[PDB]
Amino acid sequence: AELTPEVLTVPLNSEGKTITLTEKQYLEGKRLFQYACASCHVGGITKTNPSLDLRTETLALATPPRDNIEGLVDYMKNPTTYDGEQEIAEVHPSLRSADIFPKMRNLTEKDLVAIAGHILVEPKILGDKWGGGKVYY
Amino acid sequence: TTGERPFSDIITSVRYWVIHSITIPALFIAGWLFVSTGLAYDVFGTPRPDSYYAQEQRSIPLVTDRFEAKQQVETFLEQLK
Amino acid sequence: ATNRDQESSGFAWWAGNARLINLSGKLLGAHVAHAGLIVFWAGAMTLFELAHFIPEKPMYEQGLILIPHIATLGWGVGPGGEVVDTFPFFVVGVVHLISSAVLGFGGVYHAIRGPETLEEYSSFFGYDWKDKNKMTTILGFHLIVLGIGALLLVAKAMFFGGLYDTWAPGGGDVRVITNPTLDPRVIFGYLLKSPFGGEGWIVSVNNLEDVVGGHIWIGLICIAGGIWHILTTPFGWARRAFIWSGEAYLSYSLGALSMMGFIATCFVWFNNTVYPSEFYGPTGPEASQAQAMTFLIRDQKLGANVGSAQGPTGLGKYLMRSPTGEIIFGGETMRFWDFRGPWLEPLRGPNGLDLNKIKNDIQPWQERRAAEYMTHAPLGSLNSVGGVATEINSVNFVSPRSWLATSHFVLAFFFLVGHLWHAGRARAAAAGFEKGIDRESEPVLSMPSLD
Amino acid sequence: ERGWFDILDDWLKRDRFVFVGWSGILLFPCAYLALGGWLTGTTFVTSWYTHGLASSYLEGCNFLTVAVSTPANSMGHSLLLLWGPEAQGDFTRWCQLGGLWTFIALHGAFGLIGFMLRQFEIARLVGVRPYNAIAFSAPIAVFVSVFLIYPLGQSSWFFAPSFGVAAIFRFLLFFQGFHNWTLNPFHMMGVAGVLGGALLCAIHGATVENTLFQDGEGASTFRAFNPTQAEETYSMVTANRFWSQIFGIAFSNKRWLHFFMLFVPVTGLWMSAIGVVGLALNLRSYDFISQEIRAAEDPEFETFYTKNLLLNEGIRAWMAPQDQPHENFVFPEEVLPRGNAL
Amino acid sequence: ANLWERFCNWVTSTDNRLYVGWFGVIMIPTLLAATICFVIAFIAAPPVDIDGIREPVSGSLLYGNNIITGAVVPSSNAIGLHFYPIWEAASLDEWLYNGGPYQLIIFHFLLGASCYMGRQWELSYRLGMRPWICVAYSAPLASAFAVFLIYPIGQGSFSDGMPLGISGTFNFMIVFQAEHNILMHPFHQLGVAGVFGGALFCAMHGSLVTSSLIRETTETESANYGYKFGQEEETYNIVAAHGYFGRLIFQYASFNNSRSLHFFLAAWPVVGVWFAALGISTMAFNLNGFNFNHSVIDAKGNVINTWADIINRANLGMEVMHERNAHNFPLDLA
Amino acid sequence: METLKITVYIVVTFFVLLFVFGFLSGDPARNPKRKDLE
Numbered sequence A: 001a002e003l004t005p006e007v008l009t010v011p012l013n014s015e016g017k018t019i020t021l022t023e024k025q026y027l028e029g030k031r032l033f034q035y036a037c038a039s040c041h042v043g044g045i046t047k048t049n050p051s052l053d054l055r056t057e058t059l060a061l062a063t064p065p066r067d068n069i070e071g072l073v074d075y076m077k078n079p080t081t082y083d084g085e086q087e088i089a090e091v092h093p094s095l096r097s098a099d100i101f102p103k104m105r106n107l108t109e110k111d112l113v114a115i116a117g118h119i120l121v122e123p124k125i126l127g128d129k130w131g132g133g134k135v136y137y
Numbered sequence B: 001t002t003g004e005r006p007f008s009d010i011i012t013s014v015r016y017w018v019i020h021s022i023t024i025p026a027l028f029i030a031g032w033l034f035v036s037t038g039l040a041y042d043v044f045g046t047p048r049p050d051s052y053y054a055q056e057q058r059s060i061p062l063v064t065d066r067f068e069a070k071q072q073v074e075t076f077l078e079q080l081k
Numbered sequence C: 001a002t003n004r005d006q007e008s009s010g011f012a013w014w015a016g017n018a019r020l021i022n023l024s025g026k027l028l029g030a031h032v033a034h035a036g037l038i039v040f041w042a043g044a045m046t047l048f049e050l051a052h053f054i055p056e057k058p059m060y061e062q063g064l065i066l067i068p069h070i071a072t073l074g075w076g077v078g079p080g081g082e083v084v085d086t087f088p089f090f091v092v093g094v095v096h097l098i099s100s101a102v103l104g105f106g107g108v109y110h111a112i113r114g115p116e117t118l119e120e121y122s123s124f125f126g127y128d129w130k131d132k133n134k135m136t137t138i139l140g141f142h143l144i145v146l147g148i149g150a151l152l153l154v155a156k157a158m159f160f161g162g163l164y165d166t167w168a169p170g171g172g173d174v175r176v177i178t179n180p181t182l183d184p185r186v187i188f189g190y191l192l193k194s195p196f197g198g199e200g201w202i203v204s205v206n207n208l209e210d211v212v213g214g215h216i217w218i219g220l221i222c223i224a225g226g227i228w229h230i231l232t233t234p235f236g237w238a239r240r241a242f243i244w245s246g247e248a249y250l251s252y253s254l255g256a257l258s259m260m261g262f263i264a265t266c267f268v269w270f271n272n273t274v275y276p277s278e279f280y281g282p283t284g285p286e287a288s289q290a291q292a293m294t295f296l297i298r299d300q301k302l303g304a305n306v307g308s309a310q311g312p313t314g315l316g317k318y319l320m321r322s323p324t325g326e327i328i329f330g331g332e333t334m335r336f337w338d339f340r341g342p343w344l345e346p347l348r349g350p351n352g353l354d355l356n357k358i359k360n361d362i363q364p365w366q367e368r369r370a371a372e373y374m375t376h377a378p379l380g381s382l383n384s385v386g387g388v389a390t391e392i393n394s395v396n397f398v399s400p401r402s403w404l405a406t407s408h409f410v411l412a413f414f415f416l417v418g419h420l421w422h423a424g425r426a427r428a429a430a431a432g433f434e435k436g437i438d439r440e441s442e443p444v445l446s447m448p449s450l451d
Numbered sequence D: 001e002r003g004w005f006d007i008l009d010d011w012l013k014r015d016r017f018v019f020v021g022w023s024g025i026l027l028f029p030c031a032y033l034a035l036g037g038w039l040t041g042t043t044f045v046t047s048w049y050t051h052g053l054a055s056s057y058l059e060g061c062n063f064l065t066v067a068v069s070t071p072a073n074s075m076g077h078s079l080l081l082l083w084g085p086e087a088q089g090d091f092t093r094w095c096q097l098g099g100l101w102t103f104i105a106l107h108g109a110f111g112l113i114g115f116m117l118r119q120f121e122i123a124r125l126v127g128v129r130p131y132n133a134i135a136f137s138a139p140i141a142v143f144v145s146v147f148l149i150y151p152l153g154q155s156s157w158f159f160a161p162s163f164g165v166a167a168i169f170r171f172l173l174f175f176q177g178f179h180n181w182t183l184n185p186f187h188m189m190g191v192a193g194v195l196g197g198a199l200l201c202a203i204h205g206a207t208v209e210n211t212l213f214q215d216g217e218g219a220s221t222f223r224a225f226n227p228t229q230a231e232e233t234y235s236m237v238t239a240n241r242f243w244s245q246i247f248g249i250a251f252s253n254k255r256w257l258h259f260f261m262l263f264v265p266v267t268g269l270w271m272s273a274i275g276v277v278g279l280a281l282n283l284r285s286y287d288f289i290s291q292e293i294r295a296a297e298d299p300e301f302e303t304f305y306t307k308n309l310l311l312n313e314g315i316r317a318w319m320a321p322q323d324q325p326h327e328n329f330v331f332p333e334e335v336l337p338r339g340n341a342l
Numbered sequence E: 001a002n003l004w005e006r007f008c009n010w011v012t013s014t015d016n017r018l019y020v021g022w023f024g025v026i027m028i029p030t031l032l033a034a035t036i037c038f039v040i041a042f043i044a045a046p047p048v049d050i051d052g053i054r055e056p057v058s059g060s061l062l063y064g065n066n067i068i069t070g071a072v073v074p075s076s077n078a079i080g081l082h083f084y085p086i087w088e089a090a091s092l093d094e095w096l097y098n099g100g101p102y103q104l105i106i107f108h109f110l111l112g113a114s115c116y117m118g119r120q121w122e123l124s125y126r127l128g129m130r131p132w133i134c135v136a137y138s139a140p141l142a143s144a145f146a147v148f149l150i151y152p153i154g155q156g157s158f159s160d161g162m163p164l165g166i167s168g169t170f171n172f173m174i175v176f177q178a179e180h181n182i183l184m185h186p187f188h189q190l191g192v193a194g195v196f197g198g199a200l201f202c203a204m205h206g207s208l209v210t211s212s213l214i215r216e217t218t219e220t221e222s223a224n225y226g227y228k229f230g231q232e233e234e235t236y237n238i239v240a241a242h243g244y245f246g247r248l249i250f251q252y253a254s255f256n257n258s259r260s261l262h263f264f265l266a267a268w269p270v271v272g273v274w275f276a277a278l279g280i281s282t283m284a285f286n287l288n289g290f291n292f293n294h295s296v297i298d299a300k301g302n303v304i305n306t307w308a309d310i311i312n313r314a315n316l317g318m319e320v321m322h323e324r325n326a327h328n329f330p331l332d333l334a
Numbered sequence F: 001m002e003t004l005k006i007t008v009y010i011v012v013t014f015f016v017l018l019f020v021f022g023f024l025s026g027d028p029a030r031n032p033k034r035k036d037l038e
Ligand code: CLA
Pocket: C002, C003, C004, C005, C012, C013, C014, C015, C016, C017, C018, C019, C020, C023, C026, C027, C029, C030, C031, C033, C034, C101, C104, C105, C108, C111, C112
């Protein structure tokens, strides 16, 4: 099995547009995700709130939709609760709160796209492991 | 002592190293090439990183019959297109 | 080559340094060169850390142990321990590294070029281990030196910028200490505190006024003691109590160092004042408590009444009582109720955690901090995979508190072993049977049978 | 009577750097192949077709995780000979089917036979009593019980230990979860023999070293001994008084002391072997019936025994699907045993 | 001689059937106290709430235990590292419920055994012996400290100290494996090399000495009668033993120096056990065994399991089951 | 409980004092050979 361009092709937006990540982008996405997100999100779960995971289905059912590049980049800029009702930048890492989450300070737009690409591609590889927790280890 | 030349004699002699400065690197290089040419994989039947699964398969190729086991492995191998 | 084989010295190569026991010049050499090695490591390791250092990740995510030591002293950091200038780290590193050259130069000189014995060269630098007065004198010089060191800590804290204070009002920050605790009831009160839970002996020191005052006391005590030992010679009772030989003095010092190592292990494990969690990561207790806090916050946002929530065992799911009635976090963290930290204390009233403050006054920064600490708990593998033992690879993290604690337990233990070894040997040698039993004078042979 | 047999006998027993012997004809090829098989397998050979595991340096394993793994369960107890009906003379397929496992197990067994024969042969030539071979009977009982009889009692070689560090660790944990092996009095006697043996080793070494006669001038005391000397190098009388006063009893007879040093770890290993023969048949010390009757009727009754059983249940359910792939276990999440939160 | 002087002479006397000594002066009351409390508790103690969740565990014989299942149960998690002597309880019934006997016993014991080590030094000195037998004893002693004191300190509770019983010991081991992956820790591995090696070398030395005993008896009597207590000559022929062993392996793999040999017999298990103790004492601060969970990954990124991952599944079973009622939040952080 | 506590404190103190004053009573000289170690 291989990491093909097809595997690396993921939704850019909600209107049926896709983008194809380079292998370098995939690697960058894994590195940046480990750097800024894995402390809470290792394996696709969420340690400080296990009710919400990073599975593609979960993200699709988020408001606004979070199962595409745009949705995820926006989330990393201005994160909301699952229903979109509250802005949670004060307690979740984002560009908007890079003052209080200093690791977001050097994340560039390119970086955010890479992280998003990681979050979308990983379950295409790992399946239920992603967001699965220890049951699937 | 039991008659053979003491090791400390041998490995401090010029001749030993004239021989072994060739024989030792030669063996090391041979072992390297055994892996680097990919021969090892084929000799022992070890999957390369792209040969554990077909592209969409996620089930282990477990051998389940004793006497047709060879053919099963051949079939698993064929299934990697 | 005086004394450099087993036949002349009595010691095999693997005990070769024992050939130095009565060779003061060369022994001076060994000591100075070793000091050189220590200072060398301090410099080099600091420069390594600084080179690998990313200013906007927490220090504890980066495998740093010396930069935290520097930042604790108030150098390079600002509010909440954020790095504002890496230059002092650079200075500390370079200066130690350069000094190590001077030390090594001296050490090598005395070790292989200088006078092998110092006694003929100088009565002042020469010594006989069995000369008690000279021993107490050198001891005294060194006590004065240590006193001065403690006083340098004091001077930093009071006149040269202050120290990093995790407890500063408004949030952790660098702060000048203006009123050090001088009251002996406080200072020595720490010394008489139980080492068990909720007490914690000197490890419980939780404010810099006490730290600084304590160092004033230790500075004066060491200088005074130094002077005392320069001016006196051991009294009769001491003379009859101790063994007086190089190996004996070494063994005594090994006992002292072992004790100090165990102490430092506990300090770095429990204390979050002189080892600020901003730099070292949260303590184990801290992170456990922080988990509790994190889920209380989440569930209460969902609408849970956390004060009245009965857990499966009958104890409070979030909140319960300590054995003396104080309101504490529930679950397994019931064990860690003696934990105290600046992010938690605003929720604490006279009877412990306060339900009104919990319901009404938890700030987003407290939630952030509790999340951070809960997810940087000091658990991880030898190959630095962060988390519980069953966690998958992904996070490269082992807490500095763990590195420091484990390293110093291993060292302290081996140092106790060394104390037993050298103390036992010193006794046997002083009595004259360290090389074995005299066949013609076996003591047991002149003793009455046991039965 | 100087025929070819006696000439060969002459050659085999030459006092050379590495003694050969008649036993060497069995020992050397068998030991060499066993070690070579292990090194060869752990370096190059997979366990993908037998276990669904990577198991070699080639695949990315390290020294702790490499192994030569047992054959698939479907092989049963096949000798799995290279020219056998399974591999049919095909070396690559043989490696993929786990033939190196039986190669190593079998050559290793004959090699151990060879080594003990070597202990006999050398003892006989030199003129000493053969207690070293006798003591070696314990490694033999262990290897035979664990690597042969145990899986012969089970479904297949699959459940034998696989030859590797982590693989062995897995064997330990499996035995805990499925067999409750720590509860077994035969294992317990084994533990007593091993730790008691280590204790004797340490205490005897230290005692000798600390009741030495001063037989030289040096502070390093090793040189003050001569192999040919008639005299004891340490005082048994002083040793005896010290231990009598410290611990209440002491050795007084050196011959008994040394025999006891044989007896303790050898007997311990033998007892462990017996318990493993029982486990070959799942004839376990798993439960105390009285405990279970009381506990089943009384939901407040709790001991460390019941607690350990809950741990075992966890082990079985959580490890089985991946550890026993031929069973095709699918345990839905909801059936997995778990305490609160975890 | 005055009274204090005579007392000192008796205490340090080399003529007592059991040596007392100054270390013995502390050792004797402490060991008696721990022993007496342990015996009474083992037989008759009521159940103890080890995990502080009002879920008392029965350890004593009279309360439904046998020798194998019985224990003196660790003190309550509600107590943590707090000092809980009898006089801190409102009543003995309370003291018992909360696991007070455990603290009494382990503290008196650790002190007493520390004094046992000291005493080995002390008698070595009175008898004109070399002093290092005590150093050997430091290896099992450090191990007891690790499991009774250091591990609790690191984890924040005596409730996580090793139980004083057989099955309780096994419980401690299984939980330790779930929480630290001790098997994959090199210090535990050195420990195993130390005890396996010790048993091996014990058997080896036993068998070689026994093999080379000099003929001094007939066939109808024990060979043991060929040695007499305090005889001056060695009772076996070491040159013959070495002649055997050096040929079993090769010449330079066998010891011909008895002192060197016995030193090795002391050092190997002692060092190995020192590391065993340090494994427990460092895992106490959660620096754990090697973790290779999902270390091997294919070209697409599928996880390729190794034996380390199977170990991981077993560890998960242990983890999710242990103390089934004591966790309310998703991470077990001590 | 208080009587128990005082009692135990007194006992502990007694034995600790024996240990200390005991090891101070010319211990290096209590050996079979060379006694003068002052
Ligand atoms: C911190 C480690 C340390 C230090 C400082 C020393 C120091 C010493 N050892 Mg010891 N030793 C050590 C570890 C150490 N040892 C270890 C680990 C072992 C076991 C292998 C020994 C075994 C041993 C034996 C058997 C003996 C000593 C002896 C000595 C002394 C004389 C050395 C000599 O004559 O060599 C001569 C060596 C040379 C001429 C070669 C070069 C030596 C120099 C120092 C190297 C300097 C390199 C350095 C990078 C230069 C930087 C210069 C720059 C600053 C300008 C000296 C004081 C001897 C002694 O006691 O004699 C009285 C002795 O017999 N040692």
